[PDB]
């Protein structure tokens, strides 16, 4: 019924095709991160462990398994025109620096950073395009915290705060005041981190909640779940 | 785009030899590949087609079983080879590109042919063999089909090729009516099913050669004897 | 400071233009719509034969 | 302070004069013309193969060929005739937002989260399509863009600033800038001398593309402008946004015509077209629909269903023959 | 099983 | 007996009814409101096929029952033999791939990305389709209609000793039919649970360890109907095979409802593969 030339251009959409499937097989296997956070809250120092002009995008292969990481701090425009792009994204790697809590915004308006931090968190976890996302929450500069902390009481971000001056207490205090922003605890899992000089440990966290997460999507595909 | 073809030389009749073409310059893995044969005096002829991933070939009946084209897209290599070589078997071996999609120009670049000697469907009719002209008056070619090339779904598979004194043929007309890339405005492709003309106003010293009519429209793929311009 | 002049400007700029009245506008859209009706495939089922877009 | 008083003095002067210009709404100047009727429009044609999200599609010119991007890093131009895959094209960046068919056929162009338009050239000697040019200089995402010929095009950034791009040197000739929020697409006039942008503002712009500047601006949305679309004879434009609320605004009269929405209908509008005519204004939604309004009766002619997610691009051929319609769920429907 | 069989 | 007969008819009867109407709305679910593109969809069309078909070979064995002899020929027993050791062996061999698949999907998940894949679970199922053939050919080979007491019995048929290759066809159908399938169902539903204990969306909060004991007892119950429903009829014919027994109405009642509840499987697969499966679920629950 088809021409010789129409038979041919038949064959090279079929060539299309097969480079397409084998291109979205290759795409599957593979794991995609959105990393959010502030600017000073230490993307690029973790950025760095684990490797170890717009989108950012990081690839490294970790226990046969391949990462996208996904840096999106260029962008300046209004994040709700574009957030849905990550909609399926397997985790959203979350940054705070936990020494911003005696630094206040170098804007004019006097509010600390870590209160910035907390809304932005606030924002992309209850998002509706991130419902069932997982979220690894790094909590970096550990190690100014605390000395910051023995030098600063911690009362200082909001009075509130009546517990007992300590690294570990605040350390504590501070990943449950961010772990109590999520309002679906039973769908959504924070996987929380005290970022430290080891590049190995950083990398093995991160696998460890992709893992659990792709346990939940077997499971959801199987049917169990 | 470079075509460069090797393996040619006298063979015994009966014997066997592996014509190869190495192609240079362009994505060779995406277009489909033609081999066509030219006797000493005559026209041209087409031989086998092996398409784009090896996934269709065909050969004309004239060598089917007897020859074979396969290709190597990691050397961007076309190979044919030849086996129980008769007395027929002699001309240049022309491989020929062609790629195949909605709007493409398929047989637009030939290769400079290899020399092989050996020694011991739908007709196409060019109705003239030769005719003297002179630079700045308008020439009409014509040629014919037994059938019509018209196919249903509007596109009529008719090609005009030139081939210029000791050179390869270059397409100038693809489906009847489209002009090959660098072509100039002075050639023009026009008619009607199993009638068609190839029209040069305002004609130039290097049009001169031999000019040929060929069918898409099925797979024997075949040519006309060939009209000839003269100074 | 310069903001406000160039705002102030390009205001201006914007303020003094020519308007038609919007019936006429209107009377144009409609207009335009009828004389080009025919030749509108989407406004009317078109017979198949002339559809390019048929079965297989 | 005298700043804001002399601006809210000459808003309201310009409001004047809009309300004065205005006596006869278009609504009961159509009441006498009979309705289109229902319009049921059959799918052609399932084109099959992005395996990923759509995000954006453009008919060529010759009303055949039409170009697709998708967020799996792929442009595949389509014969819609035949379905077949006549290219398909790898991209850097797999965030794209946006692409465009050159009218003559020969370029390709297409942008995203990458802040950059990447030209791409369809008719090379190797037989392969090769990036011929990465147009940069956004600071934002790219939303639209649309080529005014094989060496021109306009693009939309998420800066909130439009760009003229002179492709062969690469560097943008004219820059139009006057939106405060984002821009989210923009539409070329027949003619191509001037253009018209929505952003997320809630306004639109009109451009002179040599004079470089704005010459009307359209404020009737609530919450933002998605998709902008000339009006056939280029003297109107409809706009859709997320008020899900669709706007025909005319040019000369300076203000809004006549506004298209339904209770039962409250989601966001993703993209707008316009028949051959112009009677019909296709409008693709959030809620997985099409709705084909009466462009002059502003009553839902007919609806385009069979799309599983958000319908993300539609776009009309120039002979008017067929639409398309591209959604979330990886596929491109030939409708008719 | 063990119906036939 | 008349009580007997209606025993005995009865259950045979509407084991039938029960099996078909499910396995057939599932597999047209499957081709309606589902489609399949998981390996899950292939894997539960399978086996509501094989289900399906079995069941169907119950009418006929019910009326050789009744009616005391086969009336049907020796080209519908060899359709009827055949048809019933091929779907006993294609549906557990489904079973043991689900689990399988399972296992893989919760214990290996970096593997299961390369592995899980709709293309890979086809070939799977023709693997599965290809081994139950090692045993439908020669049973189909060996069916016979000899003639007993004046009414023929279409039982098997076997060479030479006959005890010899009787026996073997029955340790071979006890050993890759009810050990193995057992073995690997077990196995790989213990390891899958243990290591979903560690998991972090299943532990913690009240509801996520309710979402583990969901899984658990689904588990539990599969493996469970598995055993209770395939053990009877087993154990049964051995006991047959060494020792005779007197044809009592006991005698008669227990082979038959050993030999539907042995089919019995097959009617609630249909249940616990399907309608207990979230996306199913999530189909059902929008129209
Ligand atoms: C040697 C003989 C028994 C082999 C013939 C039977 C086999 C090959 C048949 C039996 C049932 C068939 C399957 C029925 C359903 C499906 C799911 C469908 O989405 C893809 C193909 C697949 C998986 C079929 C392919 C072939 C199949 C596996
Ligand atoms: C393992 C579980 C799930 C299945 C249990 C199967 C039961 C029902 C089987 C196993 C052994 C069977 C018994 C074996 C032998 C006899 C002697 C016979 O003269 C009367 C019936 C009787 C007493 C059988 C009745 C059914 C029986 C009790
Ligand atoms: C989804 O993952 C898999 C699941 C199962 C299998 C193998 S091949 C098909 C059947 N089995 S079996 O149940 O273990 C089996 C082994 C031996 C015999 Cl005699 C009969 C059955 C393979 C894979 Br990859």
Not at chain 1, 191 to 217: E, G, L, M, P, R
Request: with cysteine; aromatic share 10%; proline share 3%.
């Amino acid at each position: 019924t088809l021409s010789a030339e129409d038979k041919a251009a038949v064959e090279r959409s079929k060539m299309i095709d097969r480079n397409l499937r084998e291109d979205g097989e290759k795409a599957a296997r593979e794991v995609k991160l959105l990393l959010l956070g502030a600017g000073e809250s230490g993307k690029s120092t973790i950025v760095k462990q684990m490797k170890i002009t717009g989108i950012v995008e990081t690839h490294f292969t970790f226990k046969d398994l391949h990462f996208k990481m996904f840096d999106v701090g260029a962008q300046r425009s209004e994040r709700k025109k574009w957030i849905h792009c990550f909609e399926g994204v397997t985790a959203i790697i979350f940054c705070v620096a936990l020494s911003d809590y005696d630094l206040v915004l170098a804007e004019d308006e006097e509010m600390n950073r870590m209160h910035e931090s907390m809304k932005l968190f606030d924002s992309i976890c209850n998002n509706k395009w991130f419902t069932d996302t997982s979220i690894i929450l790094f909590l970096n500069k550990k190690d100014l915290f605390e000395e910051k902390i023995k030098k600063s009481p911690l009362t200082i971000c909001y009075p509130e705060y009546a517990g007992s001056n300590t690294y570990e207490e605040a350390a504590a205090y501070i990943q449950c005041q961010f772990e109590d922003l999520n309002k679906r605890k039973d769908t959504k899992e924070i996987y929380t981190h005290f970022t430290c000089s080891t590049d190995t440990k950083n990398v093995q966290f991160v696998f460890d909640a992709v893992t659990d997460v792709i346990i939940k999507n077997n499971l959801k595909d199987c049917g169990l779940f | 785009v470079q075509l460069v073809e090797s393996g040619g030389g006298l063979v015994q009749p009966g014997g066997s030899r592996k014509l190869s073409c190495s192609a240079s310059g362009f994505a060779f893995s995406s277009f489909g590949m033609h081999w066509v044969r030219q006797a000493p005096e005559k026209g041209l002829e087409w031989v086998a087609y092996i398409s784009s991933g090896s996934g269709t070939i065909y050969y004309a009946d004239t060598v089917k079983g007897r020859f074979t084209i396969s290709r190597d897209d990691p050397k961007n290599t076309l190979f044919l080879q030849m086996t129980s070589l008769r007395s027929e078997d002699t001309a240049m071996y022309y491989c020929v590109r062609s790629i195949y999609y909605y709007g493409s120009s398929p047989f637009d670049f030939w290769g400079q042919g290899t020399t092989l000697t050996v020694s011991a469907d739908i007709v196409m009719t060019q109705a003239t063999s030769s005719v003297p002209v002179t630079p700045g008056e308008s020439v009409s070619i014509s040629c014919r089909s037994s059938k019509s090339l018209l196919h249903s779904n509007g596109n009529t598979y008719l090609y005009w090729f030139l081939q210029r004194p000791g050179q390869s043929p270059q397409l100038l007309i693809y489906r009847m009516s489209n002009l090959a890339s660098g072509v100039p405005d002075r050639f023009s492709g026009s008619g009607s099913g199993t009638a068609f003309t190839l029209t040069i106003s305002r004609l130039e010293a290097e049009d001169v050669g031999v000019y040929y009519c060929m069918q898409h429209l099925e797979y024997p793929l075949t040519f006309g004897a060939g009209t000839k311009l003269e100074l | 400071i310069a903001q406000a002049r160039k705002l102030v400007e390009q205001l201006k700029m914007e303020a003094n233009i020519d308007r038609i009245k919007v019936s006429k506008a209107a009377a144009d859209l409609m207009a335009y719509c009828e004389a080009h009706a025919k030749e509108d495939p989407l406004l009317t089922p078109v017979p198949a034969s002339e559809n390019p877009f048929r079965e297989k | 302070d005298q700043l804001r008083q002399e601006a809210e003095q000459l808003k309201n002067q310009i409001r004047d004069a809009r309300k004065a210009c205005a006596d006869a709404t278009l609504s009961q100047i159509t009441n006498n013309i009979d309705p289109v009727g229902r319009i049921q429009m059959r799918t052609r044609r399932t084109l099959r193969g992005h395996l990923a999200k759509i995000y954006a599609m453009h008919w060529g010119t010759d009303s055949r060929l039409l170009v697709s991007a998708s967020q799996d890093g792929k442009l595949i131009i389509w014969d819609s005739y035949t379905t077949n895959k006549v290219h398909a094209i790898p991209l850097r960046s797999s965030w794209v937002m946006t692409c465009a068919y050159a009218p003559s056929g020969n370029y390709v162009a297409c942008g995203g989260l990458d802040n950059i338009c990447s030209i791409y050239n369809l008719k090379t000697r190797e037989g392969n399509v090769r990036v011929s040019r990465e147009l940069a200089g956004h600071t934002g995402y790219l939303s639209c863009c649309r080529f005014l010929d094989d060496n021109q095009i306009v693009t939309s950034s998420g800066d909130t600033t439009c760009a003229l791009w002179d492709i062969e040197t690469g560097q943008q000739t004219t820059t139009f800038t006057g939106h405060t929020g984002d821009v989210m697409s923009l539409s070329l006039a027949p003619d191509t001398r001037l253009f018209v942008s929505g952003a997320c503002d809630a306004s639109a712009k009109l451009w002179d593309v040599r004079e470089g500047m704005c010459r009307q601006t359209f404020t009737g949305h609530e919450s933002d402008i998605n998709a902008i679309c000339f009006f056939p004879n280029g003297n109107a434009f409809a706009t859709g946004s997320d008020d899900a609320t669709c706007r025909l605004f005319d040019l000369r009269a300076d203000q809004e015509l006549m506004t298209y929405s339904h209770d039962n209908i409250i989601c966001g509008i993703t993209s707008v077209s316009f028949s051959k005519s112009g009677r019909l204004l296709l409008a693709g939604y959030d809620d997985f629909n099409c709705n084909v309004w009466d462009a002059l009766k502003a009553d839902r002619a007919g609806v385009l269903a069979g799309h599983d997610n958000r319908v993300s691009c539609l776009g009309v051929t120039d002979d008017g023959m067929a639409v398309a319609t591209g959604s979330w769920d990886s596929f491109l429907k030939i409708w008719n | 099983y063990x119906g036939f069989x | 007996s008349m009580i007997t007969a209606i025993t005995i008819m009865a259950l045979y009867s509407i084991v039938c009814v029960v099996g078909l109407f499910g396995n057939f709305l599932v597999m047209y679910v499957i081709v309606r409101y589902t489609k399949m593109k998981t390996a899950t969809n292939i894997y539960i069309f399978n086996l509501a096929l094989a289900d399906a078909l079995a069941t169907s070979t119950l009418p006929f064995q019910s009326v050789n029952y009744l009616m005391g002899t086969w009336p049907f020929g020796t080209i519908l027993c060899k359709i009827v033999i055949s048809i019933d050791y091929y779907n006993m062996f294609t549906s557990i061999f489904t079973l043991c791939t689900m689990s399988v698949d399972r296992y893989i999907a919760v214990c290996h998940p970096v593997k299961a990305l390369d592995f899980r894949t709709p293309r890979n679970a086809k070939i799977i199922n023709v693997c599965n389709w290809i081994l139950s053939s090692a045993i439908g050919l020669p049973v189909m080979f060996m069916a016979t209609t000899k003639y007993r007491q004046g009414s023929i019995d279409c039982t098997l048929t076997f060479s030479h000793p006959t005890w010899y290759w009787e026996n073997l066809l029955k340790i071979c159908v006890f050993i890759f039919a009810f050990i193995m399938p057992v073995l690997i169902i077990t196995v790989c539903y213990g390891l899958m649970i243990l290591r979903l204990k560690s998991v972090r969306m299943l532990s913690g909060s009240k509801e996520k360890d309710r979402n583990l004991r969901r899984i658990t007892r689904m588990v539990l119950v599969v493996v469970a109907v598995f055993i209770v429903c395939w053990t009877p009829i087993h154990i049964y014919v051995i006991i047959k095979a060494l020792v005779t027994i007197p044809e009592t109405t006991f005698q008669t009642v227990s082979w038959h409802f050993c030999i539907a509840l042995g089919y019995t499987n097959s009617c609630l697969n249909p249940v616990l593969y399907a309608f207990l499966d979230e996306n199913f679920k999530r189909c059902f629950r929008e129209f």
